[PDB]
């Protein structure tokens, strides 16, 4: 066995994979959904203007009730915003001010925090004393935490700066599962509806699907030519959208294992920060560095809506579970809700 | 509205007041990030200022509170998290002159001084540090003098032509590091020769921070 022989075998396998993908591509999403009725022009208004942050907002995640939302800013504090009454439910002071990611548990009892600090903090919201306290701290990562999502009240998956992801158990407090398949800095993570799979996109222009119970990777995608920054699972669970700095969103299917269409425009040349689908998945919302948010048609790839309410680069975006509204947070320290 | 709604509004107002108070308390502090290839002067500067992710230290000098930041432990793509440091006040870039002859263990063909110069040029040419002040620190003066007495300086700078004098070599290195900054109008470089006396270094850092604060206050008012 020689390294040159291994490189030749890998090249032959990649050639076989691309040949199979080219041969299996009997049609495309464009020519199939060309007969459906278009989506038309979509216009949304700012329903709620959430103010109170004194630094650039980086992360935001909705809850199960679709009413409370966690928001993280570089000021070093997490804020629990109420959508209807625009009130603050909880103000969690953080030990590390360099927070770039946060997550809301599906039960609404725990919250996550992470960022440039390798230690990931888990806080409890339903404490008996009535005050938010540090539930626990998770250490073991060597790079900055990029994203984190809750699977249940006892397990939580996340990704750090190093080319690996880790799923930890809350009861044990150690690395329950590790994934060292990626070759670049993992920056985006998205759980699947069935909670058995999850997609992770890294800076090496690749997103990989990993199983929670199995542990090994299933498929790999190399449709992007730039560092992938955002990823989101499709509501149906058979696809997922990815957004990188190449100003082009790409929808990859799990069963087809091939890109369908590219969501790009001429005047759009800036990077992408956050992408997600609606409740039905027909609309694809993407935050760009041009201070605007673009809502494209998932089937027609046409610009359905443009939101220019934010004055700074949109950093985080989140659609409610019921699809009633969508919140966006930019570096201007303001959260804006559209519908 | 009900009584619970009024109580929630009062709680939100109290939380907003607490946030404003914390912001006013944190605004008085001046933030200083640290940069430098390898371990040139990280430990030395940390020990002089005091007397696993990001480390932060607080210390008060001349009634001014300093927030220290170090990114020496983040072994990943810097371009993916450097934009978070857009709001910092000062950036202290430390470099060892004695590294003019030393080379990196990863590649013998590249020198440590060239890597430090490339890092400094990349930091200065960053789109997020157009107005951020940079303070250059030169470490190990005595070791550099000994190496100059033992070996010439032209071993790393073929275009250099001058006497093997510590003052001339230091001036040439300072000019070479200052010429890497293309934004001479908006970016200012504060060169200083660090020594064993930590008091002088702390005083120079305080004076530089004062000058940068004055310049920022004059620019915000539209006067400078």
């Amino acid at each position, epitope marked *: 066995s020689e390294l040159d022989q291994l490189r030749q075998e890998a090249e032959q396998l990649k050639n076989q994979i691309r040949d199979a993908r080219k041969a299996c591509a009997d049609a495309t999403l464009s020519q199939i959904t060309n007969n459906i009725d278009p989506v038309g022009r979509i216009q949304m208004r700012t329903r709620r203007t959430l103010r109170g942050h004194l630094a650039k907002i980086y992360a935001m995640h909705w809850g199960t009730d679709s*009413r409370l939302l966690v928001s993280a800013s570089q000021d070093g504090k997490l804020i629990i915003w109420d959508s209807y009454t625009t009130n603050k439910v909880h103000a969690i002071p953080l030990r590390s001010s360099w927070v770039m990611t946060c997550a809301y548990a599906p039960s609404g009892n725990y919250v996550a925090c992470g960022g440039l600090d390798n230690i990931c903090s888990i806080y409890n919201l339903k404490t008996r*004393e009535g005050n938010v306290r540090v539930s626990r701290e998770l250490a073991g990562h060597t790079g900055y935490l990029s994203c984190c999502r809750f699977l249940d009240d006892n397990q939580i998956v996340t990704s750090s700066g190093d080319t690996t992801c880790a799923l930890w158990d809350i009861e044990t407090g150690q690395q329950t599962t590790t994934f060292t398949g990626h070759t670049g800095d993992v920056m985006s993570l998205s759980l699947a509806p069935d909670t058995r799979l999850f997609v992770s996109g890294a800076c090496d222009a690749s997103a990989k699907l990993w199983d929670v119970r199995e542990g090994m990777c299933r498929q790999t995608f190399t449709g992007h030519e730039s560092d992938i920054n955002a990823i989101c699972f499709f509501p149906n669970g058979n696809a997922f959208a990815t957004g990188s700095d190449d100003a082009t969103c790409r929808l990859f299917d799990l069963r087809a294992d091939q890109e369908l269409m590219t969501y790009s425009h001429d005047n759009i040349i800036c990077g992408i920060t956050s992408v997600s689908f609606s409740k039905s998945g027909r609309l694809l919302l993407a935050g760009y560095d041009d201070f605007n948010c673009n809502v494209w048609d998932a089937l027609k790839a046409d610009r359905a809506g443009v939101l220019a309410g934010h004055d700074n680069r949109v950093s985080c975006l989140g659609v409610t579970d019921d699809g009633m509204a969508v919140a966006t947070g930019s570096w201007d320290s303001f959260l804006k809700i559209w519908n | 509205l009900s009584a619970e709604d009024k*109580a*929630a509004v*009062e709680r939100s107002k109290m939380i907003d007041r607490n946030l404003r108070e914390d912001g006013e308390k944190a605004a008085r502090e001046v933030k200083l990030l640290l940069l430098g290839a390898g371990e040139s002067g990280k430990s030395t500067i940390v020990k002089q200022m005091k007397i696993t992710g990001i480390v932060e230290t607080h210390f008060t000098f001349k009634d001014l509170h300093f927030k220290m930041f170090d990114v020496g432990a983040q072994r990943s793509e810097r371009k993916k998290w450097i934009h978070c440091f857009e709001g910092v006040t000062a950036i202290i870039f430390c470099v060892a002159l004695s590294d003019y002859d030393l080379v990196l263990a990863e590649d013998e063909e590249m020198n440590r001084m060239h890597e430090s110069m490339k890092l400094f040029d990349s930091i200065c040419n960053n789109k997020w540090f157009t107005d951020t002040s940079i303070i250059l620190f030169l470490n190990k003066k005595d070791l550099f003098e000994e190496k100059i007495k033992k070996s010439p300086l032209t071993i790393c700078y073929p275009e250099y032509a001058g006497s093997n004098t510590y003052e001339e070599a230091a001036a040439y290195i300072q000019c070479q590091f200052e010429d890497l900054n293309k934004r001479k109008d908006t970016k200012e470089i504060y060169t200083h020769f660090t020594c064993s006396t930590d008091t002088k270094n702390v005083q120079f850092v305080f004076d530089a921070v004062t000058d940068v604060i004055i310049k920022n206050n004059l620019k915000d008012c539209g006067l400078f």
Partner: single-chain antibody, 230 residues
Framework: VQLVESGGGLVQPGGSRKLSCSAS????????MHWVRQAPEKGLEWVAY????????YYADTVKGRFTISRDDPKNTLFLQMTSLRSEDTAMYYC??????????????WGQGTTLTVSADIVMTQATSSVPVTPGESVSISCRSS???????????LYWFLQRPGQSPQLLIY??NLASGVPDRFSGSGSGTAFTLTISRLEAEDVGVYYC?????????FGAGTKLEL
């Protein structure tokens, strides 16, 4: 958490008395404080309420001008000054904590309280006062209100309190919404006017008196309370 009350005893008519309350085990500056009085062989009655930072203070329409409530946040203490006590003010007072937010549970912990012996709005009215029940059957206490508590937001402001002889009242339901620390056997139903509290399985620890409280406005008014003997 612990709430130690002090200052009760015998007071001559026309005098003054400063009741003190020390809180521990939680953030005193985060929870709003309420005073609940209970007369011998009678029901409960709200006295006064104070919020965090003394920004919102309310008193009962009957004791306006006489009672004065204050709080020490750096010391985590509550003080209640009572002047010109009448022959009716003889009762047992309890200090209750309550926090208000989405998904909270106000009036969750009741203090021990202390006794004091001297010498148009919404009112809750219960049809029954004592229902004999044997172990094995179910319990269903009905209640009727004079005003529809169904506010425009859609939240039902109804609180159930189970007081046991010798112990402090325990919160069962704060809003259908089951509270923490209580079994799932208790349930609440009904419309905005009529309410019904049902018990799945009646155990030996569920005996006591049930009181209903409304929280649509600041002036509170407890019901008659249904007592269960077993």
């Amino acid at each position: 958490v612990q709430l130690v009350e002090s200052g009760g005893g015998l007071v001559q008519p026309g005098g003054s008395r400063k009741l003190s309350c020390s809180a521990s085990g939680f953030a005193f500056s985060s929870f709003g404080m309420h005073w609940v009085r209970q007369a011998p062989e009678k029901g409960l009655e709200w006295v006064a309420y104070i919020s965090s930072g003394s920004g919102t203070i309310y008193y009962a329409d009957t004791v306006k001008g006489r009672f004065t409530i204050s709080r020490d946040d750096p010391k985590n203490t509550l003080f209640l000054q009572m002047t010109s006590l009448r022959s009716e003010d003889t009762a047992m007072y309890y200090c209750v904590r309550s926090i208000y937010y989405y998904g909270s549970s106000p009036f969750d912990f009741w203090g021990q309280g202390t006794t004091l012996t001297v010498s148009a709005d919404i009112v809750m009215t219960q049809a029954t006062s004592s229902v004999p029940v044997t172990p094995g059957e179910s319990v269903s206490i009905s209640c009727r209100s004079s005003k529809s508590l169904l506010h425009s937001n859609g939240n039902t402001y109804l609180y159930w309190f189970l007081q046991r002889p010798g112990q402090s009242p325990q919160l069962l339901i704060y809003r259908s919404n089951l509270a923490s620390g209580v079994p799932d056997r208790f349930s609440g139903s009904g419309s905005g006017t009529a309410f019904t509290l049902t018990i799945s399985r009646l155990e030996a620890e569920d005996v006591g008196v049930y009181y209903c409280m409304q929280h649509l406005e600041y002036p509170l008014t407890f019901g008659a309370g249904t007592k269960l003997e077993l």
